[PDB]
């Protein structure tokens, strides 16, 4: 038997299907229940998505003064777009449901997009003009007095 | 800068050695000397098996 490198045969029964009950006809149906072997997609899609996701997480450890948060986050988005192009050749084209790998890809893209957005928010806070923007008191009380203790951020002095 | 230098001396040899290993499996990959393992015969026109 010439075994397929992408499919494993789990079950292979055969059945006689009688007509429901003059022109009626029986059938002999040979069933093949087959499981895909997904090593190719683990190597070529899933692991890159995990790595890109890790980089998207690590954007938030990059200091604002480095001026590199946008570069890393948005080029991670560009890499995810390249992997969407990779998957476009392989996935089924039907519309009765969404493949779980596509769901994971869009989850990762939403994560990277939110990383871009929140990095922009952080940079907006960092580069805020002291002379032009007056700090509200609630911002002080939450983000300088209350929240830093829970995040294990001890401001010197 | 000290951390950068240490990470250079740690990371570059690892990548060099791993790449060399991975590609050296391929460089010295050739088919076996005989077409059939366990059969010494070469199945070549030079080695005719006369009756």
């Amino acid at each position: 038997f010439i075994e397929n490198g992408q499919w494993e045969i789990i079950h292979k029964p055969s059945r006689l299907i009688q007509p429901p009950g003059e022109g009626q006809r029986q059938e002999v149906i040979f069933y093949l229940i087959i499981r895909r072997k997904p090593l190719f997609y683990l190597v070529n899609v899933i692991a890159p998505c995990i790595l890109i996701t890790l980089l998207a997480i690590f954007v938030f450890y990059l200091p604002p003064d480095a001026g590199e948060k946008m570069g890393l986050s948005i080029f991670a988005l560009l890499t995810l777009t390249v992997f969407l192009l990779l998957l476009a050749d392989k996935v089924p084209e039907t519309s009765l449901s969404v493949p779980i790998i596509i769901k994971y890809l869009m989850f990762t893209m939403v994560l990277v997009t939110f990383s871009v957005i929140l990095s922009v928010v952080v940079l907006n806070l960092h580069h805020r003009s002291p002379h032009t923007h007056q700090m509200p008191l609630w911002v002080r009380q939450i983000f300088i007095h209350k929240l830093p203790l829970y995040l294990r951020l001890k401001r010197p002095k | 800068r000290t951390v950068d230098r240490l990470c250079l001396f740690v990371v570059t040899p690892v990548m060099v050695v791993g790449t060399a290993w991975i590609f050296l499996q391929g460089v010295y990959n050739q088919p076996p000397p005989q077409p059939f393992p366990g059969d010494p015969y070469s199945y070549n026109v030079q080695d005719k098996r006369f009756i």
Partner: protein, 155 residues
């Protein structure tokens, strides 16, 4: 052939003792072709560019933190590796018997480049610390300003 060199080419009469004599599967004659790929095209067009581009990511350690172009270089190398993976994805079947050698190298290099991006993030985080943000302890100074530089022969 422009890609395959014939190494062995045997011919064999195969008889199945188990099958009955009145079966078509009892006898056959098989002509085999052991063929070795000529890898010059793949070498020149993928492997040397891919390997060199992956190796260049080590240059980020020699870039200064004040340049502001470290993580950009590293993530661009990752993007180029992804493009190479896209190129390779069209040329082989999606079998699970083994990871291809070029696939193994691409996975290894992409993991290494991701680690390098993380290292660059950590180095940039360390570089931009100030007294108003972080406390520079005496132990950290002893380890990273005196001991390690003379271990590492830094100027």
């Amino acid at each position: 052939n422009g890609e395959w060199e014939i190494v062995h080419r045997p011919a064999r009469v195969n008889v199945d003792p188990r099958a009955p004599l009145d079966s078509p599967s009892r006898q056959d004659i098989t002509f085999y072709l052991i063929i070795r790929r000529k890898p010059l095209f793949y070498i020149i067009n993928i492997l040397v560019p891919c390997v060199l581009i992956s190796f260049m990511v080590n240059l980020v350690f020699y870039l200064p933190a004040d340049s502001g172009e470290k993580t950009s270089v590293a993530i661009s190398v990752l993007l180029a590796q992804s493009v190479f993976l896209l190129l390779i994805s069209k040329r082989l079947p999606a079998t699970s018997m083994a990871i291809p050698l070029i696939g193994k190298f691409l996975l290894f290099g992409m993991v290494l480049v991701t680690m390098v991006v993380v290292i660059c993030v950590i180095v940039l985080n360390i570089h931009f610390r100030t007294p108003s943000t972080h406390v520079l302890s005496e132990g950290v100074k002893k380890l990273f300003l005196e001991t390690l530089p003379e271990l590492l022969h830094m100027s």
